[model samples]
Target: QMTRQARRLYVGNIPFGITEEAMMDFFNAQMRLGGLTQAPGNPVLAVQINQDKNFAFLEFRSVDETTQAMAFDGIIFQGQSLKIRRPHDYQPLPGMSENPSVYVPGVVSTVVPDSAHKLFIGGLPNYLNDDQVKELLTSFGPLKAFNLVKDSATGLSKGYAFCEYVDINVTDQAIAGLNGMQLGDKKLLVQRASVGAK
Candidate 1:
């Protein structure tokens, strides 16, 4: 019912100067609090952080455990409350919902439900970085939560991204203007992200 890809979780609000070792211990402790059995070897496989320092990824052993871990969204770590979230690349299996049914999983902090505003933009050129992609999207309006999918190993763009606008109204305008627009030999596939149960 789960894949290795589904086992990965995005951890936001990683306090400055937190190390991978510290995160490992932190998440492992939370796993126990969430009533998960400690798997031998490592229940939390790895903690990956980007140069930005605000967010990290926690790779867990199984989807069963990972979904349990999502309950720790607002738990305090060090001095900051953490955001335990599903990754942007996460795709639910056939007949499954896009997210685990824990108050709709991740984005618990979001007061305005994201379903109405989030946009999916694909067919990107890998050479584009976060800012460049944001620049293009910003032409329509400022973004609220923007994520450009990237390769975990090589740290390269994956040619697709998700975003929602601060204004919310611009979502449709951005999709209309950008979808099918040519960019570096690839026309964009922009649309409302297909989320929720089929």
Candidate 2:
């Protein structure tokens, strides 16, 4: 099946200043391209401006599209030759592990009420702004607070966010309804919130 082939593709040789929308638009322009997908739901994830001026992980709706893109791997986009390949293995930075048990952002404990539980949501969309996240979760009930961490200087989202509901019932409903649900082609990791030790 096309879906089973390989949904993730690594796109290289991207030009500097390329926005997530531009990358998606470029891939979607191709007739054979099924769709553009990105980890955590944004075209640009873990961008290292110094190491590589232009490169990103592109996902396709089907494996077939990924395979087809490979055929045009060296094709030029905005004057730069593109390199497409399937990643064999990938890992986040040393301090950025997604395992909820290990990741403890100290900011949550101060804001979240002791009575309410915490959740560590991983695999979030990179482009998922703070407003969008609140909108997605508010349907469950009154939200106590929401936080999306970002690079203090650049203000780029760190591809994850946390939401807390005042009522446990609302938190339960949100966990059940949103966990593993597809938001912009990425499955979310939703669970009880956590409290990091001081």
RMSD of each: 10.5, 18.1
**Candidate 2 accuracy as TM-score:** 0.40
Encode model 1's per-residue lDDT on 159-198: one tens digit a residue.
9877788788887888899999999899999988875313
Total clashes for model 2 = 7
Q: Which residue runs does candidate 2 get wrong by more than 4 Å?
A: 1-110, 113-116, 195-198
Residue pairs in candidate 2 whose N, alpha carbon or C atoms collide under 3 angstroms = 14-54, 40-124, 40-125, 118-192, 118-193, 119-192, 119-193
lDDT of 2 by residue, 1-198 (tens): 323224556676565578777677666665223233322332322322222434577765544345445544544455444556555554333332222232112112213434456655666787665555656776787555455555434435576666677575677778889889887878987877554323
The CA lDDT of each predicted structure is 0.70, 0.54
Q: Model 1, residue 168: displacement in angstroms? A: 25
Best by TM-score: 1
TM-scores for the candidates: 0.47, 0.40
